Design a protein around this ligand. Structure first.
Ligand SMILES: *[PH](O)(O)OC[C@@]1(C#C)O[C@@H](n2cnc3c(N)nc(F)nc32)C[C@@H]1O[PH](O)(O)OC[C@@]1(C#C)O[C@@H](n2cnc3c(N)nc(F)nc32)C[C@@H]1O
Ligand SMILES: [Mg+2]
Lengths: 400, 558
DNA sequence: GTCCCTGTTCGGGCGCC
DNA sequence: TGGTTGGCGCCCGAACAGGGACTG
């Protein structure tokens, strides 16, 4: 039917060989039901152990629906896969809706020589059965090459809608379609449903206006102790690595000698003025920060406690492209891991809308803790890369 | 017979050729057994005679089977395995009897001559060439190649396990309510039918397997409990592990310690309270399995209390999905944790232990969290769900820990149980400076070349002390300085440090460490009533960090 | 750059099938 | 007997990666 496009791995790289992690009974039953239907329609085929590659698979369940979604953790294959103006107006729209257009890829065949690398394995409960393996025959959801090959077909489908609605920005990333407009809520939702009816012929909410930056703030006191000024000097000293205009001469000279931490230090007029000048400098935007599409985005997250989470997105140290906060549930039934997984999704969603790329996360969590529960709270169709850090208690104190 | 299933296409690694190793000398008994096996396998098409057109060879041998009567023909395919393609192993784990659901009727039967009944890829057969000596100087040694899966080849396990899955697929599809646990050639079959109707379903399975060339001999067809399965005995309403025999030595070697700990690990799945920390500690630094290691007093004590656990009768029960999974964790000494998983009180599904030491410095709450994570993952494998936990930690203790700890940490639904020793935090750092407590400014400095160092403090009350160190590091002198301040202060103390390394260790509130210096610091922190630890950036002239920095830098730096 | 001290992974021995 | 293969488990040490501090 459709001529296949030859795709190959990067030079000197083999396919992915990543082990399947344990899946719950509800996820395996969902994956088994999905794979039997996908196999019935020629989308996947069973394979044996002579295929040496493997990529982990799981499933997520949307909030209020008994429908599951098959997720293949393809980011190892995406890195090994051989390699458009990002819409700058998407981040300045009133409402943006995310639509899963992953089903569109299933109508385009995949290069026969490449299907071996799409292998995955369905596990069984209590190892009743060996793992049952499959590979992809069509463009797979979650693969970096799927939106690339389907690019020409996606433009044909979106052409009439984009012409009829020029004030609506439609952007595609992986299996997701981002639709932003300045229409009033309700009118916007009518256009989203209109586009859904448009996508059904072929077959088969975000408010980026309110995304604000969290600047570095400084304490305000009528009475300063030696401890208060020591905490303030160390914070401004770190901040001067980001804002070279920060000076700490008049504040630190108040600490000369060997004093008790609870001793009261009256701020002199010079130290008082130096502090006020530092507050204005911290309001200014970081200078000389230019986004490099060829370098990775790095996202660091700090647990601030009481449901508060701060994060920074940079490519070079102290060159923050964005610094924000993510405050959530403030109770005794708080789930740290759940709030963290939700935080990395919101941060990734923002990075896609702003720069069109997914960031690499430095997660403040034990590796085993994250891998045990992170899939239980995932709701996105993409998965970002992440490493696990042993955070210093210093960066936590700097970003409040 | 030989299965009519399609072969699995297998290639060598690029640029490689088949093995060319010659046969090693064999015993007369070994030879007589191999010719009897090879003559029969040739009559059945399982092996074919080759000639000079085949230039490969691999040494073969034989060992006794578990029944200890028949012989198991093996091939030392180590060279061929290096040059054979990679496989993706399909066996993802070992089934456990605690995950078996209660069935009305149970059968356990094996496929006979499993490997030798699955055909091998025709283009790959010539690489499995071997030579069997016969009655030499009366008839030369016959050269054969394998037409079926050989024992000793890398691909045989995964190819057989996958082939067995394809063969069982139509029967599972037709009989979705017949549970079939498939491990190698062994089949556990369970139904909710009466024993008569169950046996007819078994014969349908046997006929199904026979259609795919897999026999099921009656000698390996178990029909009554207890069933011998995967090293257990399956009774109708309970299961037990086959008897475990610990070594009986007076001069334990490293090999004996491995067999001891290995069998104890295997016993901990149903025997509660097994501990292997002191025994496994005896292996730190050893090199040879023959080294006789003298048992320490607590290692011999640990062995003695394990023996008493194994002398008790113990059994497990089967899984009822309509009830919840409950995991209860008991704290043992020195980072050791045992647990029991059950659904009805005093009816363990299984037990287990956890004692993996993670991190140089940790506390009992961190380890309990790690044990919960391990039990959760292990529960998802066996049962497909997370258990409800019963933990010997106060709700307030957990609230205090996850409040101050900078990492994301979480424990699923859990209820407190008063089973001492309870898990608690042995000290707490103040959030604010302490009024009326002496303020210590600590610092250390070490010389990278000479390894000489200095640690000390200055206080707001005029006290100062400097201690010289040898064979130290900058990081150690910073910890020595904090330790020095703790020793020379009262029950309440403010400490200011410039070392975020030392600050990060102490804020995590460890109660145990691999470092003796950190352990001495922990012991001081427990004796204190109030400690406040603060941080200042180094080399910035912030008093009195500036004063102590000049004291410890003199003579070792600049 | 190096040294230090973390962290994880991999492969060795043993255990079990 | 000794000499094979694969899965999983445990515990160990070697071999890495990543971040912070150090030298003149
Ligand atoms: P438990 O209740 O004792 O069950 C025994 C059994 C099963 C099922 O567990 C497997 N097994 C036990 N010990 C094994 C070793 N050392 N290696 C391998 F690969 N498997 C082992 C097999 C065993 O069932 P059994 O009926 O003995 O043999 C069946 C078979 C198959 C399929 O496994 C292979 N096999 C058995 N012993 C082997 C040895 N020592 N080496 C190799 F390479 N392969 C072995 C061949 C058989 O056809
Ligand atoms: Mg210092």
């Amino acid at each position: 039917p459709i001529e296949t496009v030859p795709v190959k791995l990067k030079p000197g790289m083999d396919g992915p060989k990543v082990k399947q992690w344990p899946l719950t009974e509800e996820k395996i039953k969902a994956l088994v039901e999905i794979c039997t239907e996908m196999e019935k329609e020629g989308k996947i085929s069973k394979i044996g152990p002579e295929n040496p590659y493997n990529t982990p698979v799981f499933a997520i369940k949307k909030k209020d629906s008994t429908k599951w979604r098959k997720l293949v953790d393809f980011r190892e294959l995406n890195k090994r896969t051989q390699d458009i103006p990002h819409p700058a107006g998407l981040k300045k729209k009133k409402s943006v809706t995310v639509l899963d257009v992953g089903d569109a890829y299933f109508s385009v065949p995949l290069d026969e020589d490449f299907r071996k690398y799409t292998a995955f394995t369905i596990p069984s409960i209590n190892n009743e059965t060996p793992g049952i393996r499959y590979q992809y025959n069509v463009l797979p959801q979650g693969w970096k090459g799927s939106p690339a090959i389907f690019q020409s077909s996606m433009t044909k489908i979106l052409e009439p809608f984009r012409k009829q609605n020029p004030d609506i920005v439609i952007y595609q990333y992986m299996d997701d379609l981002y639709v932003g407009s300045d229409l009033e809520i309700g009118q916007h939702r009518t256009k989203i449903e209109e586009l859904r009816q448009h996508l059904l012929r072929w077959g088969l909410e975000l408010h980026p206006d309110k995304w604000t930056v969290q600047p570095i703030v400084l304490p305000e006191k009528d009475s300063w102790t030696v401890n208060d000024i020591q905490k303030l000097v160390g914070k401004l000293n770190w901040a001067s690595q980001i804002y070279p205009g920060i000076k700490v001469r008049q504040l630190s000279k108040l600490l000369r000698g060997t004093k008790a931490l609870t001793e009261v230090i009256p701020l002199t007029e010079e130290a008082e003025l130096e502090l006020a000048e530092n507050r204005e400098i911290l309001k200014e935007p970081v200078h000389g920060v230019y986004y490099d599409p060829s370098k990775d985005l790095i996202a660091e997250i700090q647990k601030q406690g009481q449901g508060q989470w701060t994060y920074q997105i940079y490519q070079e140290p102290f060159k923050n492209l964005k610094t924000g906060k993510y405050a959530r549930m403030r109770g005794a039934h708080t789930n740290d891991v759940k709030q963290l997984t939700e935080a990395v999704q919101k941060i990734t969603t923002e990075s896609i809308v702003i720069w069109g790329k997914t960031p690499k996360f430095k997660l403040p969590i034990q590796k085993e803790t994250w891998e045990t529960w992170w899939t239980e709270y995932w709701q996105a169709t993409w998965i970002p890369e992440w490493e696990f850090v042993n955070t210093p208690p210093l960066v936590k104190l700097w970003y409040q | 017979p030989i299965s009519p299933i399609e072969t699995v296409p297998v290639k060598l690694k690029p640029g490689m050729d088949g093995p060319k190793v010659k046969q090693w000398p064999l015993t007369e008994e070994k030879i007589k057994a191999l010719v009897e096996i090879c003559t029969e396998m040739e009559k059945e098409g399982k092996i074919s005679k080759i000639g000079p057109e085949n230039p490969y060879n691999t040494p073969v041998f034989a060992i006794k089977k578990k029944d200890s009567t028949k012989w198991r023909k093996l091939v030392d395919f180590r060279e061929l395995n290096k040059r054979t393609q990679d496989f993706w192993e399909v066996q993802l784990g070992i089934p456990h009897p605690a995950g078996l659901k209660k069935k009305k009727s149970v059968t356990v039967l094996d496929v006979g001559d499993a490997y030798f009944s699955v055909p091998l890829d025709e283009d790959f057969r010539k690489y499995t060439a071997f030579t069997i000596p016969s009655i030499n100087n009366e008839t030369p040694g016959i050269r054969y190649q394998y037409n079926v899966l050989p024992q000793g080849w890398k691909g045989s396990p995964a190819i057989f396990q996958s082939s067995m899955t394809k063969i069982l697929e139509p029967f599972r599809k037709q009989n979705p309510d017949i549970v079939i646990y498939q491990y190698m050639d062994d089949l556990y079959v369970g139904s909710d039918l009466e024993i008569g109707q169950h046996r007819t379903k078994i014969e349908e399975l046997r006929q199904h397997l026979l259609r795919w060339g897999l026999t099921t001999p009656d000698k390996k067809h178990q029909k009554e409990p207890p069933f011998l399965w995967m090293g257990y005995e399956l009774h109708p309403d309970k299961w037990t592990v086959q008897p475990i025999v610990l070594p009986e030595k007076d001069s334990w070697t490293v090999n004996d310690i491995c067999k001891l700990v290995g069998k104890l690990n295997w016993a901990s799945q149903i025997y509660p309270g097994i501990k292997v920390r002191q025994l496994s500690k005896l292996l730190r630094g050893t090199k040879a399995l023959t080294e006789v290691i003298p048992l320490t007093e607590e290692a011999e004590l640990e062995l003695a209390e394990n023996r008493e656990i194994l002398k008790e009768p113990v059994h497990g029960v089967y899984y009822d999905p309509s009830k919840d999974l409950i995991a209860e964790i008991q704290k043992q000494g020195q980072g050791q944790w045992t647990y029991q998983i059950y659904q009805e009180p005093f009816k363990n599904l299984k037990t287990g232990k956890y004692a993996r030491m993670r991190g140089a410095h940790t506390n009992d709450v961190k380890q309990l969290t790690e044990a919960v994570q391990k039990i959760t993952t292990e529960s998802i494998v066996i049962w497909g769900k997370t258990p409800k936990f019963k933990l010997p930690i106060q709700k307030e203790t957990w609230e205090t820990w996850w409040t101050e700890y900078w990492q994301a940490t979480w424990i699923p639904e859990w209820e407190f149980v008063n089973t001492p020793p309870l898990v608690k935090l042995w000290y707490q750092l103040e959030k604010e400076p302490i009024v009326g407590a002496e303020t210590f400014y600590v610092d250390g400095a070490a010389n990278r070349e000479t390894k000489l160092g200095k640690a000390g403090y200055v206080t707001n009350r005029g006290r100062q002390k400097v201690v010289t160190l040898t064979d130290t590091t900058n990081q150690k002198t910073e910890l020595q300085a904090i330790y020095l301040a703790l020793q020379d202060s009262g029950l309440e103390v403010n400490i200011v440090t410039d070392s975020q390394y030392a600050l990060g260790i102490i804020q995590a509130q460890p109660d145990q460490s691999e470092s003796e210096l950190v352990n001495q610091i922990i012991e001081q922190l427990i004796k204190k009533e109030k400690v406040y630890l603060a941080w200042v950036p180094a080399h910035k002239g912030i008093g009195g960090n500036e004063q102590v920095d000049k004291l410890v830098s003199a003579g070792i730096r600049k």
